[PDB]
């Protein structure tokens, strides 16, 4: 559970990339 | 293997900083 929350983390923020360009 | 998963998380979005440059 730790390891998939760390994965959520991860996860979640790799969008914001595109939303910045 | 998680820990592999999650260092590819990590290593993936390391490149994008240069591309935003």
């Given amino acids: ?3 998939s929350k ?3 983390l ?3 923020l ?3 990339a ?3 360009k």
Avoid: G, T, Y
């Fill in 10 to 12: 991860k996860s979640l």
């Fill in 18 to 20: 595109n939303n910045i």
């Fill in 14 to 16: 790799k969008e914001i």
């Fill in 6 to 8: 760390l994965n959520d």
């Fill in 1 to 3: 559970q730790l390891d």
